[PDB]
Amino acid sequence: HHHHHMVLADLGRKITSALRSLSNATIINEEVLNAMLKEVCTALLEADVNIKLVKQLRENVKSAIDLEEMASGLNKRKMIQHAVFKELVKLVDPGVKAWTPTKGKQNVIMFVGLQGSGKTTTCSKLAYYYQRKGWKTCLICADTFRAGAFDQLKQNATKARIPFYGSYTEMDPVIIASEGVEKFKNENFEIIIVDTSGRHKQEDSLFEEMLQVANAIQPDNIVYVMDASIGQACEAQAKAFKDKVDVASVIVTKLDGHAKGGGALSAVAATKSPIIFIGTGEHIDDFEPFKTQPFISKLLG
Ligand SMILES: [Mg+2]
């Protein structure tokens, strides 16, 4: 796994090629600019970005660039590249600030996801992240001890030395969560992370159980964990989540190993749901916060 410098390397290679050709054109004119936008738009469609979002990006770049009469002192090939960079950041950016825990407060974070989302590993990763930043953090499994994800979260918590709460008798996941959050609030924890059952294929049953547990524990933030390998079909998925909760965040997994990561990122951003982290592998530190400007910076660098 040495081949690429960025998860969107194939998209980035096509965009930097387009931009290099424009910066090397002997004269910069509308034909040269349009040739570049064509290559950029095509690369984004080949990354499974939705046509509507690709058409809007092109509009925006053409609206930002005024070739005919232009500012004295500007390098106009550089201005065009900055216009494209800026519009690529917008394309993966929700336009909205994500919720963050407050220091000195108790913060309850509830996870939801469909089967195959990587929800449960993502829980321990978020806990490790906050534990490493000096927060007193804990995990609750609001699920039956017979579920595979119960042992999974417990063994992950043990290795990381993160306090874990599950029940070895209680059948009702709502009661489990309530009891778990009560215990950890009483023990002065700052970050309290609640994993729910991931054994849902349909949104219907997933969002049903989601509201049951939400109402019981009053979470400060709900994180939807999504498999990004479905590309732009992430939009409908993210919209339905966002319409059902007030304080909504998304963590994307499976962003690698396929060509559709740009589509997935831009679909979620199109719903104005902020992706807060990316899960990048099997290990507990395979995890990174999602910052759009540095993300696009590293891609085109
Ligand atoms: Mg945007």
Curated annotation (Swiss-Prot):
Highest taxon, organism lineage: Eukaryota
Coarse class of the protein's main subcellular location: nucleus
Gene Ontology MF: a single term: GDP binding
GO biological process: exocrine pancreas development; granulocyte differentiation; neutrophil chemotaxis; protein targeting to ER; SRP-dependent cotranslational protein targeting to membrane; SRP-dependent cotranslational protein targeting to membrane, signal sequence recognition; SRP-dependent cotranslational protein targeting to membrane, translocation
Location of the region described as NG domain in the Swiss-Prot/TrEMBL record: 6-300
Compartments in which it is found: Nucleus speckle; Cytoplasm; Endoplasmic reticulum
EC numbers for this chain: 3.6.5.4
Reaction(s) the record says it catalyses: GTP + H2O = GDP + phosphate + H(+)
Keyword terms of this UniProt record: Cytoplasm, Disease variant, Endoplasmic reticulum, GTP-binding, Hydrolase, Nucleotide-binding, Nucleus, Ribonucleoprotein, RNA-binding, Signal recognition particle
Record-listed GTP binding positions: 113-120, 195-199, 253-256
Cellular component GO terms, alphabetical: cytoplasm; cytosol; endoplasmic reticulum; nuclear speck; nucleus; signal recognition particle, endoplasmic reticulum targeting
Reported effect, C141Y: In SCN8; decreased granulocyte proliferation; delayed granulocytic differentiation; impaired signaling; induced autophagy
Consequence of changing T120A: In SCN8; decreases expression levels; decreases GTPase activity; decreases neutrophil numbers and migration capacity
Assembly notes: Component of a signal recognition particle (SRP) complex that consists of a 7SL RNA molecule of 300 nucleotides and six protein subunits: SRP72, SRP68, SRP54, SRP19, SRP14 and SRP9. Interacts with RNPS1. Interacts with the SRP receptor subunit SRPRA.
Function description: Component of the signal recognition particle (SRP) complex, a ribonucleoprotein complex that mediates the cotranslational targeting of secretory and membrane proteins to the endoplasmic reticulum (ER). As part of the SRP complex, associates with the SRP receptor (SR) component SRPRA to target secretory proteins to the endoplasmic reticulum membrane. Binds to the signal sequence of presecretory proteins when they emerge from the ribosomes. Displays basal GTPase activity, and stimulates reciprocal GTPase activation of the SR subunit SRPRA.
Family membership noted in the UniProt record: Belongs to the GTP-binding SRP family. SRP54 subfamily.
Illness association: Neutropenia, severe congenital 8, autosomal dominant: A form of severe congenital neutropenia, a disorder of hematopoiesis characterized by maturation arrest of granulopoiesis at the level of promyelocytes with peripheral blood absolute neutrophil counts below 0.5 x 10(9)/l and early onset of severe bacterial infections.
Record note on domains: The NG domain, also named G domain, is a special guanosine triphosphatase (GTPase) domain, which binds GTP and forms a guanosine 5'-triphosphate (GTP)-dependent complex with a homologous NG domain in the SRP receptor subunit SRPRA. The two NG domains undergo cooperative rearrangements upon their assembly, which culminate in the reciprocal activation of the GTPase activity of one another. SRP receptor compaction upon binding with cargo-loaded SRP and GTPase rearrangement drive SRP-mediated cotranslational protein translocation into the ER. The M domain binds the 7SL RNA in presence of SRP19 and binds the signal sequence of presecretory proteins.
Name used for this protein in its record: Signal recognition particle subunit SRP54
UniProt source species: Homo sapiens (Human)
Gene name, Swiss-Prot/TrEMBL: SRP54
Residues of the full protein shown: 1 to 296 of 504
